[PDB]
Paper text:
Ngb is over-expressed in hypoxic conditions and it may be involved in gas/redox sensing, radical scavenging, and/or signal transduction. Notably, hexacoordination in Ngb accounts for a peculiar structural rearrangement and complex kinetics upon ligand binding, which takes place when the distal histidine (His(E7)64), engaged in internal iron hexacoordination, dissociates from the heme. The dissociation of His64 is the rate-limiting step for ligand binding and it triggers a repositioning of the heme which slides further inside a large internal cavity. In this study, we spectroscopically and structurally characterized three Ngb mutants aiming at pinpointing key features: a CD loop mutant with enhanced flexibility (Gly-loop), the F106A mutant and the double Gly-loop/F106A mutant.
The double conformation of the heme in 70:30 proportion, along with corresponding histidine double conformations, is present and His64(Nε)-Fe-His96(Nε) angles are unchanged with respect to WT. Besides some alternate conformations of the N- and C-termini, of the AB and EF loops, due to crystal packing changes, only the CD loop was significantly altered. Owing to the mutation of Tyr44 into a glycine, the propionate flips toward the proximal side of the heme, and the amino group of Lys67 is rotated by 180°. The absence of Tyr44, that is not pinning any more the loop to the heme, allows the displacement of Phe49 which might explain the D-helix destabilization. Quite surprisingly, the hydrophobic cluster involved in the support of the heme, and including the canonical Phe28(B10), Phe32(B14), Phe42(CD1) and Phe61(E4) is loosened in the Gly-loop mutant. As shown, in Fig. 4D, Phe42 and Phe61 are displaced with respect to the WT Ngb phenylalanine cluster: Phe42 is located about 0.6 Å further away from the heme (Cε(Phe42)-C3 methyl(heme) distance), whereas Phe61 is laterally shifted of approximately 2.4 Å (Cζ(Phe61 wt)-Cζ(Phe61 mutant) distance). The mobilization of the CD-loop-D-helix unit could facilitate the His64 dissociation from the heme iron, unlocking its swing-out displacement, thus leading to the increased CO binding velocities observed by rapid mixing.
Numbering used by the authors: 0 to 48, 56 to 150
The structure:
Protein backbone atom coordinates (compact mmCIF):
# COMPACT_ATOMS: atom_id res chain seq x y z
CA UNK A 1 0.00 0.00 0.00
CA UNK A 2 2.46 2.85 -1.07
CA UNK A 3 0.42 5.87 -2.31
CA UNK A 4 0.93 7.41 -5.71
CA UNK A 5 3.16 10.45 -4.82
CA UNK A 6 5.75 8.19 -3.13
CA UNK A 7 5.29 5.53 -5.85
CA UNK A 8 6.12 8.23 -8.44
CA UNK A 9 9.18 9.33 -6.46
CA UNK A 10 10.45 5.79 -6.67
CA UNK A 11 9.50 5.32 -10.36
CA UNK A 12 11.18 8.63 -11.42
CA UNK A 13 14.39 7.98 -9.48
CA UNK A 14 14.49 4.40 -10.73
CA UNK A 15 14.28 5.66 -14.33
CA UNK A 16 17.40 7.74 -13.63
CA UNK A 17 19.22 4.69 -12.22
CA UNK A 18 17.94 2.48 -15.02
CA UNK A 19 19.88 4.55 -17.61
CA UNK A 20 23.04 2.78 -16.36
CA UNK A 21 22.18 -0.17 -14.09
CA UNK A 22 25.61 -1.84 -14.10
CA UNK A 23 27.40 1.44 -13.41
CA UNK A 24 25.06 2.15 -10.50
CA UNK A 25 25.12 -1.48 -9.33
CA UNK A 26 28.90 -1.34 -9.12
CA UNK A 27 28.59 1.74 -6.87
CA UNK A 28 26.17 -0.18 -4.64
CA UNK A 29 28.51 -3.17 -4.39
CA UNK A 30 31.62 -1.11 -3.86
CA UNK A 31 29.93 0.44 -0.81
CA UNK A 32 28.69 -2.99 0.27
CA UNK A 33 32.14 -4.50 0.22
CA UNK A 34 33.53 -1.49 2.17
CA UNK A 35 31.00 -2.21 4.87
CA UNK A 36 31.13 -6.04 4.67
CA UNK A 37 34.21 -7.23 2.84
CA UNK A 38 33.53 -10.84 3.94
CA UNK A 39 30.97 -11.03 1.07
CA UNK A 40 33.60 -10.85 -1.66
CA UNK A 41 34.60 -14.58 -1.68
CA UNK A 42 31.07 -15.57 -2.67
CA UNK A 43 31.73 -14.25 -6.15
CA UNK A 44 33.82 -15.84 -8.90
CA UNK A 45 37.32 -14.39 -8.51
CA UNK A 46 36.42 -12.84 -5.15
CA UNK A 47 38.68 -15.04 -3.08
CA UNK A 48 42.25 -14.89 -2.13
CA UNK A 49 42.32 -18.80 -2.21
CA UNK A 50 29.98 -22.83 -8.93
CA UNK A 51 29.89 -19.13 -7.99
CA UNK A 52 28.09 -16.16 -9.50
CA UNK A 53 29.99 -13.63 -11.55
CA UNK A 54 29.90 -10.15 -10.12
CA UNK A 55 28.56 -8.11 -13.08
CA UNK A 56 25.99 -10.81 -14.04
CA UNK A 57 24.83 -10.80 -10.34
CA UNK A 58 24.48 -6.98 -10.50
CA UNK A 59 22.17 -7.38 -13.56
CA UNK A 60 20.13 -9.93 -11.53
CA UNK A 61 19.94 -7.65 -8.45
CA UNK A 62 18.79 -4.70 -10.63
CA UNK A 63 16.17 -6.91 -12.34
CA UNK A 64 14.73 -7.88 -8.92
CA UNK A 65 14.63 -4.24 -7.85
CA UNK A 66 13.02 -3.43 -11.20
CA UNK A 67 10.22 -5.93 -10.46
CA UNK A 68 9.76 -4.36 -7.04
CA UNK A 69 9.42 -0.94 -8.59
CA UNK A 70 6.93 -2.26 -11.15
CA UNK A 71 4.98 -3.56 -8.12
CA UNK A 72 5.66 -0.62 -5.81
CA UNK A 73 1.93 -0.08 -5.04
CA UNK A 74 1.55 -3.72 -3.90
CA UNK A 75 4.41 -6.27 -3.60
CA UNK A 76 2.07 -9.24 -2.84
CA UNK A 77 2.51 -11.02 -6.26
CA UNK A 78 6.33 -11.13 -5.66
CA UNK A 79 6.20 -12.61 -2.16
CA UNK A 80 6.67 -16.27 -3.12
CA UNK A 81 9.54 -15.42 -5.48
CA UNK A 82 11.24 -13.26 -2.82
CA UNK A 83 10.85 -15.90 -0.14
CA UNK A 84 12.46 -18.38 -2.56
CA UNK A 85 15.24 -15.89 -3.28
CA UNK A 86 15.92 -15.48 0.45
CA UNK A 87 16.17 -19.27 0.84
CA UNK A 88 18.76 -19.29 -1.95
CA UNK A 89 20.95 -16.66 -0.29
CA UNK A 90 20.66 -18.40 3.09
CA UNK A 91 21.78 -21.67 1.54
CA UNK A 92 25.03 -20.09 0.31
CA UNK A 93 25.92 -18.43 3.57
CA UNK A 94 24.65 -14.90 3.17
CA UNK A 95 23.41 -13.76 6.57
CA UNK A 96 20.08 -11.98 6.71
CA UNK A 97 21.86 -9.09 8.39
CA UNK A 98 23.81 -8.55 5.16
CA UNK A 99 20.56 -7.44 3.49
CA UNK A 100 20.46 -4.49 5.87
CA UNK A 101 23.91 -3.57 4.63
CA UNK A 102 22.61 -3.85 1.07
CA UNK A 103 19.89 -1.38 2.00
CA UNK A 104 22.48 1.13 3.29
CA UNK A 105 24.45 0.61 0.05
CA UNK A 106 21.34 1.14 -2.07
CA UNK A 107 20.52 4.45 -0.33
CA UNK A 108 24.19 5.45 -0.89
CA UNK A 109 24.02 4.62 -4.56
CA UNK A 110 20.74 6.59 -4.92
CA UNK A 111 22.23 9.58 -3.10
CA UNK A 112 25.12 9.51 -5.65
CA UNK A 113 22.83 9.13 -8.66
CA UNK A 114 20.41 11.87 -7.62
CA UNK A 115 21.98 14.49 -5.34
CA UNK A 116 19.33 17.05 -4.15
CA UNK A 117 16.65 15.11 -6.13
CA UNK A 118 17.09 12.37 -3.49
CA UNK A 119 14.53 14.13 -1.32
CA UNK A 120 13.67 13.05 2.29
CA UNK A 121 10.37 11.57 0.97
CA UNK A 122 12.22 9.79 -1.83
CA UNK A 123 14.68 8.31 0.69
CA UNK A 124 11.89 7.21 3.05
CA UNK A 125 9.92 5.72 0.12
CA UNK A 126 12.88 3.72 -1.00
CA UNK A 127 13.60 2.57 2.58
CA UNK A 128 9.97 1.32 2.85
CA UNK A 129 10.04 -0.39 -0.56
CA UNK A 130 13.38 -2.11 0.07
CA UNK A 131 12.33 -2.95 3.65
CA UNK A 132 9.28 -4.73 2.22
CA UNK A 133 11.45 -6.68 -0.22
CA UNK A 134 13.72 -7.78 2.62
CA UNK A 135 10.66 -8.64 4.79
CA UNK A 136 9.52 -11.06 2.08
CA UNK A 137 12.99 -12.43 1.59
CA UNK A 138 13.39 -12.96 5.35
CA UNK A 139 10.73 -15.74 5.29
CA UNK A 140 13.64 -17.66 3.75
CA UNK A 141 15.57 -17.79 7.00
CA UNK A 142 12.45 -18.90 8.80
CA UNK A 143 13.58 -15.45 9.98
CA UNK A 144 10.70 -13.02 9.40
C1 LIG B 1 24.94 -9.34 0.41
C2 LIG B 1 24.44 -9.30 -0.79
C3 LIG B 1 24.50 -10.43 -1.70
C4 LIG B 1 25.38 -11.46 -1.91
C5 LIG B 1 26.72 -11.73 -1.24
C6 LIG B 1 24.73 -12.23 -2.92
C7 LIG B 1 25.20 -13.45 -3.38
C8 LIG B 1 24.58 -14.33 -4.25
C9 LIG B 1 25.01 -15.68 -4.53
C10 LIG B 1 26.26 -16.30 -3.93
C11 LIG B 1 24.16 -16.21 -5.45
C12 LIG B 1 24.18 -17.61 -6.06
C13 LIG B 1 23.09 -18.45 -5.37
C14 LIG B 1 22.97 -19.81 -6.02
O1 LIG B 1 23.51 -20.07 -7.11
O2 LIG B 1 22.28 -20.70 -5.51
C15 LIG B 1 23.16 -15.19 -5.70
C16 LIG B 1 22.15 -15.34 -6.60
C17 LIG B 1 21.23 -14.32 -6.87
N1 LIG B 1 21.16 -13.15 -6.17
FE1 LIG B 1 22.30 -12.47 -4.75
N2 LIG B 1 23.55 -11.73 -3.26
C18 LIG B 1 23.38 -10.61 -2.62
C19 LIG B 1 22.27 -9.78 -2.72
C20 LIG B 1 21.22 -9.87 -3.64
C21 LIG B 1 20.07 -8.99 -3.68
C22 LIG B 1 19.90 -7.81 -2.75
C23 LIG B 1 19.30 -9.43 -4.76
C24 LIG B 1 18.02 -8.93 -5.31
C25 LIG B 1 17.46 -7.81 -4.89
C26 LIG B 1 19.98 -10.59 -5.31
C27 LIG B 1 19.58 -11.34 -6.41
C28 LIG B 1 20.13 -12.53 -6.80
C29 LIG B 1 19.48 -13.32 -7.86
C30 LIG B 1 18.29 -12.88 -8.67
C31 LIG B 1 20.17 -14.48 -7.91
C32 LIG B 1 19.93 -15.64 -8.83
C33 LIG B 1 19.16 -16.69 -7.99
C34 LIG B 1 18.85 -17.95 -8.77
O3 LIG B 1 19.70 -18.65 -9.30
O4 LIG B 1 17.68 -18.31 -8.89
N3 LIG B 1 21.10 -10.82 -4.56
N4 LIG B 1 23.42 -14.08 -4.93
Amino acid sequence: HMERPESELIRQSWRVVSRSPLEHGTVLFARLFALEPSLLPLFQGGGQFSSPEFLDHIRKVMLVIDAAVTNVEDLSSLEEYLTSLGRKHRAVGVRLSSFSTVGESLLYMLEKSLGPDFTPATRTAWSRLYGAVVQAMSRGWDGE
